[PDB]
RNA sequence: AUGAUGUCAUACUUAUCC
């Protein structure tokens, strides 16, 4: 009465989204069509868990919260800390707070419509895929080269990398400005 | 049989051949299969393919 | 039964404008059952005074999209987007694309890219490679919409109508790479959405009066003509938003519905100001108009002049 | 069961069903009461009565065994009265 | 005629009274029939959608309305 | 007036909604609710979608206050974002025969269903027709 | 109080003991003349320029649409048995008795 | 493993649990054997004994 | 060869500049750079699992040119 | 609500009787149970307001003085277009307090 | 190295309440 997962994956045009719990549904064809939509979002990962999505962060004691630059550039945090130290007033300004709230307003980092909150969502700070020919600033500092990164001197001798065959890096077969020395 | 994202859960080898045949670059490969610009009458008579027009240009 | 028509010239031919019209054969008006399609070609002789049938190339699907693109004709028959060239016997298809979801309902071709509009899915941006004759879709949308008509506002911003009586405007992100090789990687964000309430089928951004500013003039299926005009000043946009917020509390609709609920029927409102609700300030009560002007720190003739200034700048 | 056929009390008499129901109640409950006769009068007062509701009202009234037989005997007599063109059961034609 | 099935009440809880809400034990065919009935009711309620549906077909508005009202009961068949 | 400050509060809600302890998720969720009713119709929906991401995992729990909190949350998010996005998060969960995911996603889907039942029509995806039943609604495919 | 200039522009002001608000628009390459007329039982203004615009208020909202005809030099209101609500407009060496029957505030 | 909270309480880093009073963190020393679970991290840091 | 051992590092380096660092050569599929819990700091030696072996043998050839914090970086097969 | 979770509302048919609030429960909302942003008045059911049941509070159930209203957050969330929210049941509240 | 249950404190919510 219930089809197997291989028969459901062979019949579906997009078999990279089928799960093991979708065979126990009442209509796998409609679920497979709805799961393969263009702008659809998946369900949360707490459907099979037993921690109720809030009991996993028991021993994690990180920073409770961080204030923005528009609030830190007003001097209210230091005055509040001085008042808390005196209790355990300021009257700095009235137009500077309005200027920090209107003119010096910083747009926060929002998220995508499909960017749902994961369980941990703090130890997986993934970011695109900084590949061959493109590096971050600081690691430039450790490397200490003034404005090729010097092991692309040895990418001369030993050859183009097996891992990224399509590679071009400056000065060799790739005829470079700022950070990015290969594409 | 080269593997793929849809053929990850395949176990039998008989289904894998059909999966590799259907996955076979979807169904396109046709950028210039008609462009030939046949002179002849140049109005309603110029039914030729890309390779046919290439052979007609190489011959004359 | 014809569904698409286009009149342009071919790159292989001279300056002779050809009129290509796609038709369908035995189209069911219920189960979408179709037997086949055809594409008739016209000569447009006597400087566009008489049409002569040159050729009639058949098709397997019903063509609902015909648009010129770099000297060739883009023919969309069902879910197959094909680039056909001018031939002596029939239209030779030089390219083909089967990445459409259900069916290609409309096609607007930019000078570099191509924007095809699906039936139930939102429009997607597709780049056509001239070297290999391969069309690649480089952008898509996150929300599906039954699009009926669309118009290119810029090289990356496109506004399309909805069959549910709404109007949407999608803008591509500046970090989107056109040179590429759930559905697509790069998504397009909707910068403007507004439920007009009437079925729109014709959109055109042009100047209605010489000397004024261009506006997004839109038509309706109920015999109505509307126009959308962008705000030139942030202070004027904030004043119009405050006037609309005052009018939504001072003059409710007579049908018992909410203005925000009417504007958010299909999609939520984003950067849209209904001028028809602001036009009721002259028809409402004088005491309520004076209270709204005191809340806006102005005069009721000043508010009437500010409402008439945008109409004089953008309309006839 | 026997309580699935639709019947109608408007095409049947009421005075001829009182003695059979009284005998069934005297056989089931042992003695003669006034609540069971009133329940039997209320069950036949409607022009379109409910056999399942009457069985539930009399399905547990006794113990759950004599009430089913009483409902099966009252449904067949009402069916024989409604099927006849006169509107009387078979026990009224002889006497 | 012992049925032993008296869906009456328990503790003044649940007792679904709305139509089209659904439950956790709802089948796929029942949900599809409820979605089709809701789509038919939305087509019959919206005037612009009914006009756009009747302009495409060669039928009139009242005939399409009677056809949509007649197709509301048992649209699929097996619940 | 929250048409502005939404942004300011957004990352902090990120930090709070990401759970140190349940009360964070709860209260922060209530914040998402009242924000979501307040900002309605002004065009800020994007960041509310981002926050909805982090809201979404909290769906599962038996604690009454956090589950009813999350309910209020997703209701306000329903009206603000519009149903289409909601439903696009609620589709796959329906199916699940597991005695949990179906209970919940059907509870949600009901909450989304009662209100705005009129506007849902467009967003039900295409579902292919089987043997005994025709699951394609062809009316939407009539083309002039 | 409406006032037409020698250029293709005109400036109006309210009627009060002091001059209040002002408005202006490009009516042009023609001297803007002002003529009073009776439109729909109300006092309306008839302009004489390259385009003949007729200004009339409609539910506390002004509405001025041009005429779909040739330009005239002078105009005056007319009222007779054959023409109950019309306008006698003087053209270039020609006299024309016209009337605005259909509401010409919308797109004709 | 003893860490102070921001409200006048203790929190165990190795046991990854909360402590209500000062006696609670002082009773998770003989108990809460997270020290025996550090042998896997010690073997991962150094392959030799 | 799929994995390499990497010695002689400074704790300001983390798993990220290794990620970025060795994918400059070829992608690190699995990264391992111990975090020591007790004093909360890194000893600076690494283990890298790649897609297959060819990646990692080229990695033996090219790989030991990296210099982390002015200082030398050990890469050998494992 | 947040104070009484076991209380059940009436949810009957809406009539023409305007709801009222007691002096001890003045200003409190019925659904949202808030004190700010009143937008819509409260309407009572016909059976809920008859004889001695008229002029009584909806939430408190005592002597109503001022008319009750619904919150704007409940009005925008379409929580005010439901049935009459008259407090019918009274459980785990003001029962053991009478003994002390 | 999660999770399991169970004796047993500790915080938190319900605008809880004389």
Curated annotation (Swiss-Prot), chain B:
Subcellular location field: Nucleus speckle; Nucleus
Tissue-wise expression: Ubiquitous.
Phosphothreonine: modified positions: 36
Superkingdom field: Eukaryota
Role of this protein: Component of the 17S U2 SnRNP complex of the spliceosome, a large ribonucleoprotein complex that removes introns from transcribed pre-mRNAs. The 17S U2 SnRNP complex (1) directly participates in early spliceosome assembly and (2) mediates recognition of the intron branch site during pre-mRNA splicing by promoting the selection of the pre-mRNA branch-site adenosine, the nucleophile for the first step of splicing.
Family recorded in the similarity comment: Belongs to the SF3A3 family.
Record's subunit section: Component of the 17S U2 SnRNP complex, a ribonucleoprotein complex that contains small nuclear RNA (snRNA) U2 and a number of specific proteins. Part of the SF3A subcomplex of the 17S U2 SnRNP complex which is composed of three subunits; SF3A3/SAP61, SF3A2/SAP62 and SF3A1/SAP114. SF3A associates with the splicing factor SF3B and a 12S RNA unit to form the mature 17S U2 small nuclear ribonucleoprotein complex (17S U2 snRNP). Identified in the spliceosome 'E' complex, a precursor of the spliceosome 'A' complex. Identified in the spliceosome 'A' and 'B' complexes.
Name of the protein described by the UniProt record: Splicing factor 3A subunit 3
Species: Homo sapiens
Gene label: SF3A3
Part of the whole protein covered: 440 to 499 of 501
Curated annotation (Swiss-Prot), chain D:
Region of interest: Necessary for mRNA 3'-end cleavage and cytoplasmic accumulation: 1-95
Ranges for domain PWI: 1-95
PTM notes: Phosphorylated on multiple serine and threonine residues by DYRK3 during the G2-to-M transition, after the nuclear-envelope breakdown. Phosphorylation by DYRK3 promotes disassembly of nuclear speckles.
Region (Necessary for DNA and RNA-binding): 1-95
Localization of this protein: Nucleus matrix; Nucleus speckle
Assembly: Identified in the spliceosome C complex. Found in a pre-mRNA splicing complex with SFRS4, SFRS5, SNRP70, SNRPA1, SRRM1 and SRRM2. Found in a pre-mRNA exonic splicing enhancer (ESE) complex with SNRP70, SNRPA1, SRRM1 and TRA2B/SFRS10. Component of the minor spliceosome, which splices U12-type introns. Found in a mRNA splicing-dependent exon junction complex (EJC) with DEK, PRPF8, NCBP1, RBM8A, RNPS1, SRRM1 and ALYREF/THOC4. Interacts with DDX39B, CPSF1, RBM8A, RNPS1, and ALYREF/THOC4. Seems to be a compound of RNA export complexes that are released from speckles in a ATP-dependent manner.
Record-stated family: Belongs to the splicing factor SR family.
Protein name per UniProt: Serine/arginine repetitive matrix protein 1
Biological source species: Homo sapiens
Gene: SRRM1
UniProtKB/Swiss-Prot annotation, chain F:
Naturally occurring in which organism (per UniProt): Homo sapiens
Site (Interaction with SF3B3): 45
Description of how the protein assembles with itself and partners: Component of the 17S U2 SnRNP complex, a ribonucleoprotein complex that contains small nuclear RNA (snRNA) U2 and a number of specific proteins. Part of the SF3B subcomplex of the 17S U2 SnRNP complex. SF3B associates with the splicing subcomplex SF3A and a 12S RNA unit to form the U2 small nuclear ribonucleoproteins complex (U2 snRNP). Within the SF3B complex, interacts directly (via HEAT domain) with SF3B3, SF3B5, SF3B6 and (via HEAT domain) with PHF5A. The SF3B subcomplex interacts with U2AF2. Identified in the spliceosome C complex.
Gene: SF3B1
Family per similarity comment: Belongs to the SF3B1 family.
Role: Component of the 17S U2 SnRNP complex of the spliceosome, a large ribonucleoprotein complex that removes introns from transcribed pre-mRNAs. The 17S U2 SnRNP complex (1) directly participates in early spliceosome assembly and (2) mediates recognition of the intron branch site during pre-mRNA splicing by promoting the selection of the pre-mRNA branch-site adenosine, the nucleophile for the first step of splicing.
Subcellular location: Nucleus; Nucleus speckle
Region called Interaction with SF3B3 and SF3B5, residue ranges: 88-144
HEAT repeat residues: 3-41
Lineage: Eukaryota, Metazoa, Chordata, Craniata, Vertebrata
Full protein segment contained here: 1161 to 1304 of 1304
UniProt PTM: Phosphorylated. Phosphorylation occurs concomitantly with the splicing catalytic steps.
The protein's name in its UniProt record: Splicing factor 3B subunit 1
Swiss-Prot record, chain J:
Main location: nucleus
UniProt modified residues of type N-acetylalanine: 1
Binding residue positions for Zn(2+) 1: 10, 45, 48, 84
Keyword annotations: Acetylation, Activator, DNA-binding, Metal-binding, mRNA processing, mRNA splicing, Nucleus, Phosphoprotein, RNA-binding, Spliceosome, Transcription, Transcription regulation, Zinc
Outcome when changing residue 35 to E/S/A: Alters the structure of the presumed branchpoint (BP) adenosine binding pocket within the splicing factor SF3B complex which may lead to decreased binding affinity and thus affect pre-mRNA splicing
UniProt modified residues of type Phosphoserine: 93
Superkingdom classification of source: Eukaryota
InterPro entries, per database record: PHF5
Positions contributing to Zn(2+) 2 binding: 22, 25, 57, 60
Site annotation Interaction with SF3B3: residues: 16
Pfam families: PHF5
Subcellular location: Nucleus; Nucleus speckle
Gene Ontology MF, one: RNA binding
Modified residue annotations for N6-acetyllysine: 2
Site, as annotated: Interaction with RNA: 99
GO terms for cellular component: nuclear matrix; nuclear speck; nucleoplasm; nucleus; precatalytic spliceosome; spliceosomal complex; U12-type spliceosomal complex; U2 snRNP
The protein's role, per its UniProt record: Component of the 17S U2 SnRNP complex of the spliceosome, a large ribonucleoprotein complex that removes introns from transcribed pre-mRNAs. The 17S U2 SnRNP complex (1) directly participates in early spliceosome assembly and (2) mediates recognition of the intron branch site during pre-mRNA splicing by promoting the selection of the pre-mRNA branch-site adenosine, the nucleophile for the first step of splicing.
PANTHER family, per database record: PHD FINGER-LIKE DOMAIN-CONTAINING PROTEIN 5A
Protein name from the UniProt record: PHD finger-like domain-containing protein 5A
Encoding gene (name): PHF5A
